[PDB]
């Protein structure tokens, strides 16, 4: 099972959700992200937020389409994405992806990254038309060739990240010691069909991205 | 002196740069940022990056009207933005602002935030059409009401931020202990003409922002 949560960030930043759809995918709406789901003809198994966050005409379209929708109201001192994710991480999904979680007010993106950090031991991705962002605890992880992304960047979240090691990339790294501030960001490119990154200590962010140029 | 660096992030995210120009402003181009400056009619005192990195017509357009532009090539394991800021920080400027540093590839944004952190003792802002993002070491800081921004958020960068205190805000805090992962993001609003934030240990990010619900 895979859980795809669609929040209410700027809409031009969303990928085409049809390419993220599949029979193991359960869709969840957050704020006006629910309207995006309706437009794709997907039924959210669940939605989170208040209806004040949608235009009146949109609420009419939503309740018309799904009169029985299970909506969970906004909670004090928590964002709608947070309550959605708090629930999602209890469902034993193989992967959770957050869409509509980037762009606009930067405190939203950064708050969302803090959620990934809070749940660093869970498989959660932030995804937009140009990026997939993930955070990781020590271990060994795979990276598979993906047409959507040419660039890979690693950024230390913890003060240090020990024994950082890459296989399959343009620039090789083996047992590299990483200190935040001294190492700002490591840029690289998956050259082989697949590769790994691993580290023994700390907390590490990976961003795989693309841009207009990325069409090699 | 004020240094304004224009990078190559999505053009639509830039505020109107005319509002950020001044006699004391030295503009600096990074990547495609240089084209944005030329279109705006501001000649950069210096540019960072390679011409290979620019769209074909742009290299003509730039080398055609501004051939004497002082361009400094990319360096080893450093972004163009990095080398530009490394230089800017050496010039003893009162303020350094990075435009075209948000949106698009998020590795650019996050890498730029790491630059701000390396230089946390320096007055540097990341700015776009909806945000001003700064990072801060222990101290007491004044925040001035600004019509452009009706939201103010605080996010811990260090594991802990100690003795965090707000004065002049809609949701007050006094001598609060902040733990990253446990306090994810402090949303707020400045409700006086000036307010303060202070903390005694750690590193704290401030984001002042706006959206369509700012009156």
TrEMBL record, chain B:
**Which UniProt keywords are listed?**
ATP-binding, Kinase, Nucleotide-binding, Transferase
Tell me the ranges covered by the Thiamin pyrophosphokinase thiamin-binding domain, including all copies. 139-205
Tell me the Gene3D superfamilies matching this sequence: Thiamin pyrophosphokinase, catalytic domain (3.40.50.10240)
GO BP terms: namely:
thiamine diphosphate biosynthetic process; thiamine metabolic process
Modification Cysteine sulfenic acid (-SOH) occurs at = 26, 95, 176, 185
Write down the EC number. 2.7.6.2
List S-S links within the chain: 150-214
According to the UniProt entry, its GO molecular function terms are:
ATP binding; kinase activity; thiamine binding; thiamine diphosphokinase activity
Q: Which NCBIfam families match?
A: thi_PPkinase (TIGR01378)
Q: Which PANTHER family match?
A: THIAMINE PYROPHOSPHOKINASE
Protein name per Swiss-Prot or TrEMBL? Thiamine diphosphokinase
